[PDB]
Every structure is written in structure tokens, then in C-alpha cells.
Amino acid sequence: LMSLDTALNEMLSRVTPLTAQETLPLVQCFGRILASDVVSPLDVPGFDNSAMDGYAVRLADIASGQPLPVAGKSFAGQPYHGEWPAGTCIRIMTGAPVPEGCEAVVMQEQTEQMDNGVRFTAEVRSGQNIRRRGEDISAGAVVFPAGTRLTTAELPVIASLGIAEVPVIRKVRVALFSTGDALQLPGQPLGDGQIYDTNRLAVHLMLEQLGCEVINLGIIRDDPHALRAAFIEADSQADVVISSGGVSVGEADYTKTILEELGEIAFWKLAIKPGKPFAFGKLSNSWFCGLPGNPVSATLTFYQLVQPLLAKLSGNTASGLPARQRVRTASRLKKTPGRLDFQRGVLQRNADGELEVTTTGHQGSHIFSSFSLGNCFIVLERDRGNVEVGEWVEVEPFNALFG
Amino acid sequence: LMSLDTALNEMLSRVTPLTAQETLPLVQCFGRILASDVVSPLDVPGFDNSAMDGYAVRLADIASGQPLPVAGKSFAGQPYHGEWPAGTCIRIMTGAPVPEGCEAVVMQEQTEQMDNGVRFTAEVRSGQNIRRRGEDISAGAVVFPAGTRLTTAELPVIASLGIAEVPVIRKVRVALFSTGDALQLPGQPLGDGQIYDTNRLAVHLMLEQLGCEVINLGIIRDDPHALRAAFIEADSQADVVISSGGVSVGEADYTKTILEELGEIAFWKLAIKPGKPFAFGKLSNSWFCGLPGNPVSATLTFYQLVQPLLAKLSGNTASGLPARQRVRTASRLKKTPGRLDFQRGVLQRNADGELEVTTTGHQGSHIFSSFSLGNCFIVLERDRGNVEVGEWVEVEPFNALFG
């Protein structure tokens, strides 16, 4: 009934991104959100330098027509500070400080050595090959704004400015747990109608990779106080509490009524596949996310619904989930109108070099193999029916959580 | 001269995958390589079960084309160890154990129930809708082979089997360091033509995200003896030692001679852009990778050369570099024949919902901003000359290391 977007929208709208911050050295900020704009403390480059390997010259000497002896040189961390008499030139290296009064730099290639100097073959244009100070970044400018997710692309640039540490939003704290007497820890006796608790492992893994601090309370037994105890603790230590399974997502049972008295919880029926049930709401001091028991469902729901909520809570001022792209299907897709189907597929190059998708195979939620076999989701529109080979389709590539 | 491919082959061919292993709980295995095959301790499913909610029938009573009364029901939980009165059908719910003698299952959605029995329509083709024992995973079967990089896709499957831990290749160890009087530590004054060290931070971040153990030796002073010791320390601690800057990659100098004396190090000139120079070889107990001193060059070289070598060394039996897709350029590109150009661009949806690439802007290696503004590489073929709007180009989207 309720659409994904509607649900995603109602969730995000009520959330306030975190603001608490800590200051850590650059090497520790991968994936962390900047707390406040990074303002450059200096100019970049910090001095007029050479764009090439060659010689620094003055236009009037070049005009003299005669060869020019080398009066000295400029190296990486060795700038020339000598005399530089008229009719002389200065051998210079890439990125090296240009000498005082340098009006141009000409690359070796346009140079012919001599015994009485250095001849310059081609034309010399004023200012050629002199990277000017501050031309790339100026002291006082905003290099990276707050909300930016620090990466290999940004941290090294911040380092170039002499900054050793930056203030970032504290990690998001997420509490995780499952409940039920039928659930057993892998490496235990599988009772009669029992099963191995696997969703919790799935969510823990993803949570860690996302950069969250995880408080894993393990499996809670089917007892009213043990369950209430887990919520009070979780709500008191985390920003978000997640039920990996067991706790009611709508069905009537004691977990539901316990949920109802511990916060304002909504029990939605989403127009999606796989999945459908999903619990969301506010607890005394945290947000609550309840996932469906089925492994394929809870994973899809976490990925499409929980992942985004965590991204906005972190401070990140950008979208937090892969973008889609249109492509043709080399496989026939069984789709039932009424639900937005997130099928699993395999993106690959055709013969003409273009992308096409193929189904990973059976899309039933009784098996978990589709996640391993495919590298994307084939996001089929709610109203759409069956898809025939050759039709265009929306594909969403898997992020790093799935290899 | 030398080609990216020729160079990759020479490198990889000489490397032998680590084999040392350790056994760890599933939750600590993300991104880790399986040391040995994961063999299943059971069948999945563990018995024949219904693939639908309909009714379980005998091809006999279904020939009578008469009414079949629901003798009983078998649910996902408890089966039907009762009895099946001839001439009747059994109500069965998906994942529930087909009753003894069941030859088929019909989706209730294809059978109208009269106030005396259940009739059926679409001929009940034998075996239909029956999920057989070990159909997905047969006991003693190889679920995941050694060499597999464990992810959210594979780990929960392993847990479903009752297994709580697995043996995985030990983390690859990489020693890192830079050198050159010209460099300062982000945090101190900038001398004459000094700049802050940045390559080291860049490689360190990627190495950690890549899952390696990093031994960062900082900036080594510009002295033959300090360098000599650095290598001795690095080599005695890592599987791979990487010079992020300073050590020669071809130019004659004390660093070159210390390299040549401490190991069998080759010096290549690749036909790539940015970059070109690249040192690589064997040390006493480790591989050495020497990157150009240029920021864009080093990052690029590391990404296309070292990343792949770290994957193979890790035990991973899968190509460890993103894939490419053909796409149209919405930007004019300057390219010069002779070198394989790894330009940077921005991949985005056109008005048609299809992908097109725009350039990030200036492509000189004198600035790092490209990696931040772009989301992929535009791999312009070695022989290609300029490129005009509307042309088909190859694109390699960035992986998790750049955001």
C-alpha cells in the first residue's frame, strides 16, 4: 500500500542529523563527516613554480638572440637565490620555485645546448609555464564544506594545507538485537522448530562497513522483562535501535504490545518485493527500525530503508545510496503489478560493449544466493507487469556491502 | 614505452598468494579471503517442501476429476505425520513438508473449493511446485570455494549452515614511507620551497580501506643511512613496501643506488597518463612499489597497479579492479596519441535516463581536485587523439576509495 518513497520520506523528515563532534587526525577520518567547513590557511600553489623541466628566462635576454649560460638552478626543495646576471638563464625543474624576476619558462625540448650558452628554438610567450601562486586554492577560501564525507579524494587535499586534524560528526550509534526462543547461535543444537539467527550477522556486518558504532545485544529470549530490558538499554546508548528479527512488525503478539508501550511505533505494509512489513518509530531517546524475519526481506529493507536513515543522521549532506541507470534486459522478468520489485540481476558487457542485465535466476525469498550471484538490483516499477527481453529497465548496482 | 597491460602481467606473474591463515568468527570476516572451501554440514532444504500455498495431491485422486476434501494441513512449522485418506487432498503452505507420497502441489489460486470438496483445473503436472531436499545446497557440497572474498552476500549463508567461524588468509602487510628534505609534516612551518607530504596519507587511507595492515614509517630524512635502515625495517615487517614519494623511480641519485643495492628493482616507463615512471621489484623478504612523486600520478599508479597486486597477494581468486562500460561523452576531450589516458569525469543520467560522461575540468596532474569532482575514469585508448561530443568512450567508475 504505502509506497517506498512515501515511507522513505516520512522517515527522513522526522530525523535531525547528529551534531556532536570530535577532532581526529586525517588518517582516522575515512568515511567521516566534516563538522565545519575546511578553510584553507594558505595559497596553493604557495609560490610561482615551474610547470615543466627546463629553464627560467627573461624576455629581453631571449630577444638578445644570443645563447644563455646557466647561472644556477632551482630544484624541488632547493630554490635558486643567486645573482642571475643579464644574458644568463636558470635551469629549473617541475614544481620548483621560479626565480625572482622570471618572466617565462621554456621546456627542454625547445632548447639546444652550446658551449657559450643555451639557445631557445621556439617562441617565448610572457608568463608561459609559470603556475601562479594561489591559482588553485587561495588562503581564506572554503575548500570543503561541512557535511562532506571525507575520502581519499579530500583528506589528501586537506593535508596539502598543513592541517593535521579536522572536526567531524561523531559516529552514529546503532543498537542491534534479535529475539525468539526458536533462534539459536550458529554452532549450537538446532532444536525442533528452531533456526540459526542469521539476520543479526547480516545487519552487524553492514552497520560496521557503513561506519557505525555497533552495540550488539545478541539474541533475547521470549520473556517480557528481558525484552523490555534490552530496549531501555539500547535506547539509552544508541541513536538508532534495530530489531534484526523476532520482534513484531505488525502481527499480534506480546512483542508488539511491548513495542507499543515503549514508544510511538508505526507498523507499515510497503508496496515492495521482497518484503512488505516494516516497523518505524520514536523511542524515548532513539529511533527504532524493525525488520521482517525472512533473510532476503530484512536485508533488502535494511539496504533501501535503514541505510538512507543512517546516512542523514550522520551529517552527510549528500544522498546516501547508489544512483540508477537505464539498460536493456537479456532475460525475461516475471513481475506482478502492485508492488515495486527489487529483483536481483547481473550487469555485464554485451558484444557491442554496452551494459545489459540478466536475472540471477529464481527471485524467491527462500534462498539468499541472488545476492552473491548478481551485482545489482533491477528496480521494477510498481505498476509494471512482466518484462520482455529487449525492454528498457532501471538497474541499481550493488554497493560495497555486497562485494 | 611499456604498456599498462604488459606491466600488470609482469607484476602479477611474479607474485605468489599468501597462504598463512587464521580462523575467525563470521562477524570479523568482511572483505577477508577464505583459506579453504566451506563445505556444507547439511541439506538445504532439509526435506521436500511445498513451493506454494495450495494443496498437496496424488495424481490418482486428481484423475477422478471429482471433489477432493481437505483431509488435513501441513504447515511450515509442523508437518503432517498423520494420514492421507485416499481420494483426498492436503492443504499445504509454502516451505511446509510435503506429505508422504505427495506427487504434486497445486496453487490454491487455481482451485475453486465447493462446499463438499476441492476441485482442480490446470492439469496437475507431476512433481510441480515441490522443493526437494538439497535442491539449493546438497550436504557435502562446496558452498563457497577457497579464494572467495567474504561479504554480506556470503557470510550470512555460512551462518545459516550452523558454522560460527572460518579459516581465512591472514591480512596482507604493507610498509609505507616517503622521503625528501622538501617535505614537511602537516603541522609545522613550510621552509623555502617546501610542501606538505600528502602521498603517504593517500596511500595509507587506501591501504586500510583495502584491508591491509599498514606500517607507516613516516618521512625518512634525506640521508643514505636513514633510507637504508628504513628499507631494512620495512622489508622485515611487510609483504609489500611502498615508497609514496622521494625514492627514485628512475632518476640517478643516492636513493636509486640504495634501491639497486638492497634488491632486484626494475624501473619502468609506462605508456599511461597521468604518471609514467614506476619502480618495482623484489627485496629480501618483500615486494617493493615505488610511486612517482606527483600526487595524481601516485594515486593513479597505486590504484591501477598496486591495488591489483594486493588483491592477488591476499589469496583472492577474482579480478580486483572495477569494470568498464561504453558511454557517450557530453564533453570535448583533449587526448594525445602515444599514451593510455586515465582522465577523470562525471558519470550522470541524461534526460533519457541513460549515462553520459562530462569531464571534471582541467586534467593536469598539478591538481588533486579531479578525484573529488569526478566519479569515474574515462579510459581513452592509447592510440586515440582528441575526442568530440557524442563520441563513444570507455568509463571505469571509481570504487569505494574515492567516495
Swiss-Prot record, chains A, B:
Its EC number is 2.10.1.1. Pathway: Cofactor biosynthesis; molybdopterin biosynthesis. InterPro entries: MoaB/Mog-like_dom_sf, MoaB/Mog_dom, MoCF_biosynth_CS, MoeA-like, MoeA_C_domain_IV, MoeA_C_domain_IV_sf, MoeA_linker/N, MoeA_linker/N_sf. Its cofactor is Mg(2+). One of its GO terms (biological process) is Mo-molybdopterin cofactor biosynthetic process. Gene3D superfamilies: MoaB/Mog-like domain, MoeA, C-terminal, domain IV, Molybdopterin biosynthesis moea protein, domain 2, Molybdopterin biosynthesis moea protein, domain 3. Keywords: Magnesium, Metal-binding, Molybdenum, Molybdenum cofactor biosynthesis, Transferase. PROSITE patterns: MOCF_BIOSYNTHESIS_2. Binds 1 Mg(2+) ion per subunit. Homodimer. Interacts with MobA, MogA and MobB in vivo. Catalyzes the insertion of molybdate into adenylated molybdopterin with the concomitant release of AMP. This is Molybdopterin molybdenumtransferase.
